[PDB]
A paper describes a structure:
The release of inorganic phosphate (Pi) from [name] filaments constitutes a key step in their regulated turnover, which is fundamental to many cellular functions. Here, using human and bovine [name] isoforms, we combine cryo-EM with molecular-dynamics simulations and in vitro reconstitution to demonstrate how [name] releases Pi through a ‘molecular backdoor’. While constantly open at the barbed end, the backdoor is predominantly closed in filament-core subunits and opens only transiently through concerted amino acid rearrangements. By combining cryo-EM with in vitro reconstitution and MD simulations, we have elucidated how Pi is released from F-[name] and that the hydrogen bonding network between the Pro-rich loop, sensor loop, and R177 strand forms the predominant backdoor.
Through this approach, we reproducibly formed short (~50–150 nm length) filaments and finally obtained a cryo-EM structure of the barbed end at 3.6-Å resolution. Importantly, we did not find any evidence of an ABP that remained bound to the barbed end, indicating that our structure was the undecorated barbed end of F-[name]. All [name] subunits in our reconstruction adopt the aged ADP-nucleotide state, indicating that we captured the barbed-end structure in a state that resembles a depolymerizing filament. Although the overall arrangement of the ultimate (A0) subunit is also similar (Cα r.m.s.d. of 0.9 Å between subunits A0 and A2) and remains flattened, we observed several differences when we compared it with the internal subunit A2, including small rearrangements in the W-loop (residues 165–172) and in the hydrophobic plug region (residues 264–273), as well as a disordered F-[name] carboxy terminus (residues 363–375). However, the most striking rearrangement is the downward displacement of the Pro-rich loop (residues 107–112) by ~3 Å, which—unlike in internal [name] subunits—is not stabilized by subdomain 4 (SD4) of an adjacent subunit. Hence, N111 loses its hydrogen bonds with G74 in the sensor loop (residues 70–77) and SD3-residue R177 and instead interacts with E107, within its own local loop. As a result, R177 can no longer interact with the sensor loop. In conclusion, the hydrogen bonding network formed by R177, N111, H73, and G74 is fully abolished, which opens a hole of ~5 Å in diameter in the structure that connects the internal nucleotide-binding site to the filament exterior. Thus, our structure provides evidence that, under depolymerization conditions, Pi can dissociate from the nucleotide-binding site at the barbed end without large protein rearrangements, thereby revealing the structural basis for why the ultimate barbed end subunit of [name] releases Pi at rates that are orders-of-magnitude faster than those from subunits within the filament core.
Numbering used by the authors:
A (entry chain H), B (entry chain J), C (entry chain I): 1 to 7
D (entry chain D): 6 to 45, 49 to 362
E (entry chain C), F (entry chain B), G (entry chain A): 6 to 45, 49 to 372
Amino acid sequence: WXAXCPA
Amino acid sequence: WXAXCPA
Amino acid sequence: WXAXCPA
Amino acid sequence: AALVVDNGSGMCKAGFAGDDAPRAVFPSIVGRPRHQGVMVQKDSYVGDEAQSKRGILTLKYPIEHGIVTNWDDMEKIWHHTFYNELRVAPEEHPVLLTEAPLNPKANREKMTQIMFETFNTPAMYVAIQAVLSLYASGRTTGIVMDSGDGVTHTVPIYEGYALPHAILRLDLAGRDLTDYLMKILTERGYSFTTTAEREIVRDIKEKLCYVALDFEQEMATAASSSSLEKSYELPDGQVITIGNERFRCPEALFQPSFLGMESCGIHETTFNSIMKCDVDIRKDLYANTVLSGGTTMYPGIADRMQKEITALAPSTMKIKIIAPPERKYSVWIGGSILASLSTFQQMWISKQEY
Amino acid sequence: AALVVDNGSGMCKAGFAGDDAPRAVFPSIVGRPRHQGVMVQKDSYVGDEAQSKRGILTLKYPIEHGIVTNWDDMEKIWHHTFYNELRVAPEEHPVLLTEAPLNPKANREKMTQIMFETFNTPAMYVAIQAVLSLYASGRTTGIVMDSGDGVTHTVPIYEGYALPHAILRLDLAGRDLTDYLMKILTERGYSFTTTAEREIVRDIKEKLCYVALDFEQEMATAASSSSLEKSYELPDGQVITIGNERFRCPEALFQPSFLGMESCGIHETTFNSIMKCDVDIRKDLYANTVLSGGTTMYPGIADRMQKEITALAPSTMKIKIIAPPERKYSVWIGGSILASLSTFQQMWISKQEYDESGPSIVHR
Amino acid sequence: AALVVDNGSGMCKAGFAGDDAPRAVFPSIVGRPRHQGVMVQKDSYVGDEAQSKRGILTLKYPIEHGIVTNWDDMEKIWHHTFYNELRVAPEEHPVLLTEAPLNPKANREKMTQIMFETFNTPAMYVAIQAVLSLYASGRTTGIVMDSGDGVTHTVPIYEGYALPHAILRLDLAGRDLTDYLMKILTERGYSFTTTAEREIVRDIKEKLCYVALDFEQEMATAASSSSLEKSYELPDGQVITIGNERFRCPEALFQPSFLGMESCGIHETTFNSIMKCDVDIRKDLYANTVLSGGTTMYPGIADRMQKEITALAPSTMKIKIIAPPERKYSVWIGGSILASLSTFQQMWISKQEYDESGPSIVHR
Amino acid sequence: AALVVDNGSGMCKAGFAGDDAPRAVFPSIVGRPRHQGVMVQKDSYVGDEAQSKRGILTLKYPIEHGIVTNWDDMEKIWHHTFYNELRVAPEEHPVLLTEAPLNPKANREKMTQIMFETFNTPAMYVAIQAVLSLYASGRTTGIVMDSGDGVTHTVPIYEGYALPHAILRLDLAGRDLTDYLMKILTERGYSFTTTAEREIVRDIKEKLCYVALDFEQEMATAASSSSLEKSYELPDGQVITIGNERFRCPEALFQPSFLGMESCGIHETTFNSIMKCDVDIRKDLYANTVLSGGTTMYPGIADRMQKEITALAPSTMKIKIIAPPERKYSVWIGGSILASLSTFQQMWISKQEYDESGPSIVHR
Ligand SMILES: Nc1ncnc2c1ncn2[C@@H]1O[C@H](COP(=O)(O)OP(=O)(O)O)[C@@H](O)[C@H]1O
Ligand SMILES: Nc1ncnc2c1ncn2[C@@H]1O[C@H](COP(=O)(O)OP(=O)(O)O)[C@@H](O)[C@H]1O
Ligand SMILES: Nc1ncnc2c1ncn2[C@@H]1O[C@H](COP(=O)(O)OP(=O)(O)O)[C@@H](O)[C@H]1O
Ligand SMILES: Nc1ncnc2c1ncn2[C@@H]1O[C@H](COP(=O)(O)OP(=O)(O)O)[C@@H](O)[C@H]1O
Ligand SMILES: [Mg+2]
Ligand SMILES: [Mg+2]
Ligand SMILES: [Mg+2]
Ligand SMILES: [Mg+2]
């Protein structure tokens, strides 16, 4: 992802 | 209805 | 709630 | 001076003797709240105060149709009349009361003790409403078409005295027309059923209803042309239109068969009442027909009464429907004249005689 | 044979006037999906088909208080009644309909136009619902106290033909009781808000609600023990127990102040309606009080009605509450008899007379 | 000095009678650690203390949809409110509580039990939140729409006499919008899933979200330019930008179909509540609409509410929306006035009245 | 025959429409050497070629949690899967894609741009992985718990209309289990660390570990004897023995607190999806649970799910877990059915439609 998580 | 109640 | 919703 | 208090069914009028118009004219409704109160309380609202908050009240008329239902509610309105609307105490000055024609003395006896004990008025005089209607018209002879909100009385009085045998009572009044109006208002889709909505229908009746000279001719005009349609604005902002209900509700007075009553109309009842008196005075009564009460304010009713009675009456008789513009307050206006008389002191029912 | 289509506020019944039970009985609801279709169904479902799939539909009632509020929707139910349930073409057989009394003129007028234009029925007739109920009971003089979902009308009838000046209509019926039940069902913690959840409440009302003989002593009895609590199983599987709410909902029929309405209860309304008749007729009407409609199917409502009317009525004269076991379809059965009755066959409003006059000819 | 503690779904406000603002306001959350401890504090953190250490705790809301779902956690908040925030003894001063309308009968029933056996308060009153909101404005007539954190309800009041049959309750409030905002935030790539991350979303909602006057026009505007995009900084230093989601999350209030709920919008609910009221009092309700609660603080919601009702309401009527700047604490401010009223001292539920009868006295 | 390419986090399946099994299946990894070639091949190896020589390459997963984190490697896999696996030019056959629900809009937007520009496919469609899995089962109502390598999503579907408000997505899948398994494998001394050594751990996961019926008794059983201990042979010839770790790594699916994630287990998530649905449709969803994806291939996961849901679900309810043997390729099989369905042949996205509007056409 962008914000939260990595992806 | 029209005047009074809903219908 | 008990029946319907969660609470 | 004296208080001309007219405890009429529906509109009740109060004022001082020697005046031209009643000072206080407020509805005779004792409303009570039906929904509970969560925040602030005036357990009972009486008169104009109840009308303003009529949305959350159960408006109960203490007088059904001449037959007083609650005698406790009547004292509440009389208490409201003196202390609130007039802000005067009947202790100093006598009061004058108006009486519906041909009523059981049981109604009168209870009325006598209330003024004399609950209010302690020095003097009081009970007078027939129909008799006082002609007094305000300036003539002591003739027939009075007393048609109020409750009960229509046809009293052809003579020399200022009502004829007990010639009085004919027709249970066809403004309230019955009001019920009939909302009964036929449901045809167009407008449904007024609760007591609060009843007052709304009455305002429509007083502002839009009128008597048609020819019922059959107007039906063709109403169906062919919607010119008779008129718009009225509800308190909530809604707009409604009535096409033929304007002259179908007042037409119930002349044709009671609309409401299932076997009795004849006011025009026929007026003709019947005249014949019950002696022949020698019949010509005098035909000329002097004075309408009274708020029911007879539908425009064109004098012309309709003139046309209907003329056909019923013989051609030799002459018909003159005297319709003063102040017929609603004539009962009160006549009472002011009677109380202002210097000779009125003789028949006062003083405290000693009680 | 003539169709007898008795469209009701909640449930509509269609038959053939040659039977004692309607051929097709389905709820008068049309539901439309409230979600998108990713499984690449019809645009809308009508009747019992919508009931089965009511979870994914927003159920809408085309009739509210005996007034057709959505004419486009009602043009579908009749299309569904003739072509899907009865499976008979209206163009060959006449159609009988029932309308509640004291209805707006435009409601029945538009009914005549649709059937004579969209369906092209050879003949049509609109009959008062209460009058049909009396013929089902084999009586010609009685005050029919009919109660459904939108209309609770008491029409006194004397030697037939009814009395128009004494017809009383009250807008408190089964649908209000359903809505009142969910308002008081939140008392115990059960929340039924959506339209789909409303039908579950209706099943609870039909199976567990009953009329108490005395409300005051029943309130105390339910508050001191648990013998009045009954368990109902939801479609999800949760078990819910309702106590005093079993008889509180039907009590709104006799005490409309619970819903905040100034109108008198059905027990007093029937008493008031009789008083509007002539003195001699009041002897016959009291002894021939006939209930009808599905609302009057509560256990013990007839006994409660007798007790309430007796107190209001004079003690010198008797009260007889007639409660036929088939009163749910009483309106349709009378229509079946009337359509098979020889007299009514001359009352068919034919197509040819319709075009010369228009839809306004139905009012008679 | 009567205590006025208003427990809400998101934040509970406590203070004193006679004041104008709450003394202590903190989120109504009880959180406990999930990761195992290593270095040698407390078992549970309640209030703003949980906010500071929200990165490690599992935040749980003891109140959901206006119903206390965990009485163990609820007792801690009250214990923390009295002995840590107000720092007063409840045994000497009465406590005024607020509850949502149409709540389960057992909800506040346990509330009476707790304050009468665990805290031994001398007296306690329970009042509807919407009723107290009208007190703060000083009005005596108007439809109070209280959109809180868990429950949104409209309770019309006319001259003090409330109308229970016109009370409409919606289970759509700020918490549902917070859950919806993080659902649509994943469209741009931001994923908030933990309950700790929910507070981050809630902070985003309270700062950048607003109600668009014309949703259809604004949607095209946001897709044709970049004027509506705003930048927000996460607690870890990350900078994120949100575009059309600013007016999409608050739009769910007016169009609950976004959440999949069949209930009507807040504009329809307010209009529908007025329709249930009588015709005479409708005039005094259109010009006296009162808003309250934190959810109704979106910039431009008052203007939007004016426009939406105007289309539904008759054109003759003049609709005036009252949006006081302090409507967040309108429930408490009105509650403070009630506790200080001289006439209100007779309606306190005394300790003697409770133990002699039981919790049955409440619900009166 | 329209191409049906399903790009997964761990493994991607590509084939042809109308067939029953994928034509070519290879792991979705792109690897490059971390050393220099002194001896006198290719810069990057993708697919099964990387797995064979994985001792030198650095395997990188282009897909993480169902989101394309590296579009350079995505172009390599698609270029390889068309010209080296299927041996078909993509300029003549339309291509169908599967994407996880609640994904960023940019993820499926750039998927649209690549094939319309780089491969110039005549048309293409993107469908939800869970929706396609129901097609393979031949059913039309059920909750598809699709657990893969990067994402785990449950999408309830009832009679065609899928509920978007009840769709739950979890970042708990096979790759998290693989990372967890190598973390607990260090307790026995085995220290698989490198990304090339991770694939060895996955092979252990795909052969030995299983889901226990109950966790508590198995912990005592494995710690009291050696019956559950199993031997595995490493590629270099070393032999390792793993005991209680067999039922600990898959246990993280039902107890995500082991990995530090606060999200509920797969049994609670699939139960929470049912509750968000309406009460009416819960009956047909309890008995039609469908499992899919490679994560749901553990021996005994179906029995464990049935036991866990039964405790949460009402006792009277009948819970049935459907676990077809081919559920590893369930998503692709459903996709092959869609591309052959006649009605779907018009739902594709034409090249002309893309040109006039742009990448935004895909979101509808
Ligand atoms: N201008 C009017 N047009 C039609 N009806 C009226 C008019 N004025 C009054 N009324 C009705 O006539 C009824 C009789 O009122 P009134 O004569 O003042 O009292 P009472 O009935 O006691 O004599 C009232 O109920 C009122 O609704
Ligand atoms: N056995 C019963 N017990 C309680 N309520 C019932 C029962 N049967 C029907 N009802 C209610 O009475 C209502 C009346 O329906 P019905 O009389 O069949 O048609 P209509 O819609 O014409 O009234 C129904 O909506 C139903 O909810
Ligand atoms: N300025 C604001 N903008 C947007 N949302 C707000 C604002 N202030 C409060 N809210 C939201 O409104 C909700 C209701 O909070 P509040 O009304 O203060 O107490 P209660 O919990 O009693 O409703 C809160 O959960 C909060 O997220
Ligand atoms: N029989 C099995 N036992 C244990 N794990 C498995 C098994 N089959 C597949 N898996 C795991 O499930 C994950 C997901 O693979 P799969 O569902 O085939 O494709 P996708 O990557 O699209 O989910 C793989 O990474 C694999 O490690
Ligand atoms: Mg008079
Ligand atoms: Mg019926
Ligand atoms: Mg609040
Ligand atoms: Mg997959």
